[PDB]
Design a protein around this ligand. Structure first.
Ligand SMILES: [Ca+2]
Ligand SMILES: [Ca+2]
Lengths: 268, 268
């Protein structure tokens, strides 16, 4: 079958990322999952926002937790969005505000899996997921092992495998062909199809370093993750039709795409 | 056919490394190549010695270039050699002195390839190789790209591919299946069959690190190095019969062994 199409930041190429406008359009484009970046307001309300500073995508400035939710929802998260070839910022005159996580959940249909890329953020997210009943369709992700571990201490939260463990297993497979550590049953794991890394070896005095682009998902590594484990695997940064063809051939459960509209063409 | 058996430091497990006694015994054990570690005396004579300080293997102390060749040749390079299971230091009473590179060359037969693991060292080595006529059967190696480049500026010296380039090609093959950079025609290259490395990826804030053991020589990477290039490839740190079987199966040109006596058993 086909990999799930997951809208990265609700489809950052097509519409202002992490907005309800983008979420609604991504659903309409037929995506199978919704990947959203979550931060918390100064008054403890999870909101959707990816950058470390509000100036990157809005008309405000400062960290998300420097503002109340009422202040954040007045900011236009389409402030800097551009459409290629087209000049100007089309959403400066048609604002797409920062939404709460709760609003985002409500803008998705009951079947749709949410991937939430993330103290007190973890507790605040757990409370929203509990009260809305969306914990059963939401997967908490982080690149940071401390966030993964904190999420796993919250009752009822489904948590992706930590990136440290996923990366270790992928590099063991690529470099020594061992499926180590063992799969973690039932968990989601994800990684880029192409990833710049540095490899370092140590000598008596000094070291040697190589910059290398790693392509870690292949039939063997997918089988290592998934065989007899129930693990599900997602390819990150799936951009080209060639990326999609690779993911399809090797049987990735999901692909993370910036353009749900472009991805529609991969299914007909 | 069989990989060449190359005595690492003249066969460090069997007899005091980098001594004429070890070289002579390694020849008698049927090795096909001789790997020797070269440093230079304060008065410009290349000698065989691997550690940074004389205290590691001799009854003297200090760097090699802190002593004249006359002083170095009085030191017993068997001072700390031990035979497993056997107690004591059997060469404290039967000294194996530090030899000059020139003496080492003379202790090897005219057919034997020398791998010399290395200002003014490079010039001093070039001068010995020129005057003895051994440049045609000697390959200069270093882990350090600056030493490789200096050796390549000396007329008549045969120089192994730099470790930086060999490592880059091996990791490109292992991680993305590209034979990049292209082979360097006619050159020797070498690398361990198993190598501890660290892999680092960078995030917006912070990084992720994995410690991984890399097994970089396989049929595909050997073919990348050797096909239509005339490159010759050596496996370093070949210790077990399983290591030998791998090297043989994939067609490595040579294996670097600490025990020529043990390696004899791999050929009958
Ligand atoms: Ca679903
Ligand atoms: Ca020869």
């Amino acid at each position: 079958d086909d990999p799930m199409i997951v809208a990265h930041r609700a489809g950052t190429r097509d519409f202002p990322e992490n907005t309800v406008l983008a979420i609604t359009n991504a659903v309409a484009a037929g995506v199978d999952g919704m990947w959203l970046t979550v931060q918390v307001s100064s008054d403890g309300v999870p909101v959707l926002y990816r950058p470390s500073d509000l100036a990157t995508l809005t008309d405000g400035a400062g960290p998300v937790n420097s503002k109340t939710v009422q202040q954040l929802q007045q900011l236009n998260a389409g402030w800097n969005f551009t459409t290629p070839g087209v000049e100007g910022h089309p959403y400066r005159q048609r604002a797409t505000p920062i939404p709460t996580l709760e609003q985002a959940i409500g803008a998705t249909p009951p079947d749709m899996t949410l991937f939430l890329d993330l103290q007190p953020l973890v507790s605040a997210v757990a409370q929203v997921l509990t009260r809305t009943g969306a914990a059963g369709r939401s997967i908490v992700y982080s690149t940071n092992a401390d966030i993964t571990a904190a999420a796993s201490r919250q009752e009822g939260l489904q948590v992706a495998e930590s990136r440290d463990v996923t990366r270790q297993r992928l590099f063991n497979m690529a470099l020594n062909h061992h499926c180590d550590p063992q799969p973690d049953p039932g968990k989601w794991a994800g990684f880029e199809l192409h990833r710049d890394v540095t490899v370092t070896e140590e000598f008596t005095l000094g070291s040697g370093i190589s910059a290398v682009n790693a392509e870690l998902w292949d039939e063997a590594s997918v089988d290592c993750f998934r065989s007899q484990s129930g693990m599900k695997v997602m390819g990150f940064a799936v951009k080209t039709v060639d990326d999609y063809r690779l993911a399809h051939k090797i049987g990735l459960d999901a692909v993370l795409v910036d353009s749900p509209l472009a991805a529609q063409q991969w299914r007909h």
